[PDB]
Design a protein around this ligand. Sequence first.
Ligand SMILES: Nc1ncnc2c1ncn2[C@@H]1O[C@H](COP(=O)(O)OP(=O)(O)OP(=O)(O)O)[C@@H](O)[C@H]1O
Ligand SMILES: Nc1ncnc2c1ncn2[C@@H]1O[C@H](COP(=O)(O)OP(=O)(O)OP(=O)(O)O)[C@@H](O)[C@H]1O
Ligand SMILES: [Mg+2]
Ligand SMILES: [Mg+2]
Lengths: 264, 264
Amino acid sequence: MMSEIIAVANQKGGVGKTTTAVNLAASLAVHEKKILLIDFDPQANATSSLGFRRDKIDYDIYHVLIGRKQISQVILKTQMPFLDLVPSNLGLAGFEKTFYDSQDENKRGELMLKNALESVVGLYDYIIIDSPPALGPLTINSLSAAHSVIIPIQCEFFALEGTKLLLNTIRMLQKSTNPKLKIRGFLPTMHVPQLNLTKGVLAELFKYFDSEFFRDSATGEYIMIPKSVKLAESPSFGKPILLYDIKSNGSIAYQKLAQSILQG
Amino acid sequence: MMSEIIAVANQKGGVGKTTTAVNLAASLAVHEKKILLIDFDPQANATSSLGFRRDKIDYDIYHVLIGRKQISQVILKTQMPFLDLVPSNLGLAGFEKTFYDSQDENKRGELMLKNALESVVGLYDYIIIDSPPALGPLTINSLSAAHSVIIPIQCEFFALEGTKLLLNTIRMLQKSTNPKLKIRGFLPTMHVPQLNLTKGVLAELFKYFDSEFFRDSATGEYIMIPKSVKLAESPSFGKPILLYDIKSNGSIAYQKLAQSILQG
Ligand SMILES: Nc1ncnc2c1ncn2[C@@H]1O[C@H](COP(=O)(O)OP(=O)(O)OP(=O)(O)O)[C@@H](O)[C@H]1O
Ligand SMILES: Nc1ncnc2c1ncn2[C@@H]1O[C@H](COP(=O)(O)OP(=O)(O)OP(=O)(O)O)[C@@H](O)[C@H]1O
Ligand SMILES: [Mg+2]
Ligand SMILES: [Mg+2]
């Protein structure tokens, strides 16, 4: 209902999905908009990014999906008063099995996350979903639950084929399980402007998808997350970058992203 | 000939599994060892890396796993006479369902790739398997088919939690479906030595797993693949780095890796 649910998705591995989900969630939360981050990857990197140890997590999103727990029972408060987390753990890897079992019986396996979110949509301004690297049941559940999708894009070769495919999947879902699903935007990540490869991949993407790239709401510039040493360091301190170095380039870029989201 | 089957595996996305599988395969082939590269990711990045279009592949590894085709029917010659490829395609994403069906009926499924490889173990010196980013059915099959596993590691924060988890899976399989399974080695990838994060992560990894790291036997040095612009460029040209810039640091490093493999 009230919450805009935003999936951060891209089947390619290591393109900044988690970094984006975490830092966007934080960058929205610092405005005292109430944010819920869903770690929807069994590797649980978002969870770890916010300083939570895998060995310290009790019940997680998986338990909610299978009905062992209500989502209110697993929600954790973070260092930021307006950022809450539904953590992940290894047991989310069991989801696939569950999914297929669901499909065999009268159930809509693609909607399990959507259903799980039902009881908190009226309680948050934004729900941000960190998706895993594939187009399987988990990512399908993420996209099926979302109002909109942010696609982080690393400008290297595999990005070209990959983006097209993700778009295909999205359109599939638009014609089936989630008609209202929109692209919130493409977000270049780990961006190194002067590389020939970067320029080539970007130019190719602009040709088809110019209108999909995030724009700075004050200046009209394209929003891109620069490759940043500090950004890589941040999960090692268990904090979003804005909590300790708010003037760093990565922090600044993610805050521009949040402003863009807050406007609509 | 009796193939050594080597899985390139790591559930983390974008850590150089594909770059490593492709370039190790090429680096072995130039020594007139007959290599079979198995693309075991539905995204088919290895396939694309060798100049094959996804939309142009007829039958792939998927069809072999489910018994529709014998593996000899899907093998493609590449630009290099000693390097053959079993290509992948999106339909490989259907394997999961099959796997779970199998687990449900007789608790089998882990050995489907192994079984598929039986008829070519006498025809190649090495079979290199490019694994997808997760610890699901595909990675389980890759590891269950292998003599040994190469674990590429990007030395950033998530490497710590991840590596331990991968070891757990390996141990599990060592206790179940694949007793002979060994770690061939850990391989730092996209390596930038002077970064504080890299130093910290490497120190922790040496602390627990020093003995697992790949070594150059001539110097005792740790083998690491340097971050390389040319390495990132090469798949865009459909070539292994040794065909694209044989004198580049990435090419040199992968040839060292091949030496480490060839020496035993
Ligand atoms: N803008 C950036 N600058 C420098 N390093 C970054 C940046 N963004 C992400 N990283 C680092 O690159 C690595 C990969 O990022 P990340 O884990 O967020 O991607 P991912 O898409 O979630 O990966 P996966 O597919 O495995 O889920 C991480 O170690 C992360 O810390
Ligand atoms: N040593 C390197 N230097 C520079 N770029 C690299 C290096 N190794 C890999 N890359 C690039 O980083 C990206 C990720 O590498 P790669 O696709 O091989 O990882 P992966 O583990 O196979 O990811 P996935 O889990 O999605 O299959 C690729 O764009 C690749 O070209
Ligand atoms: Mg992630
Ligand atoms: Mg790959």
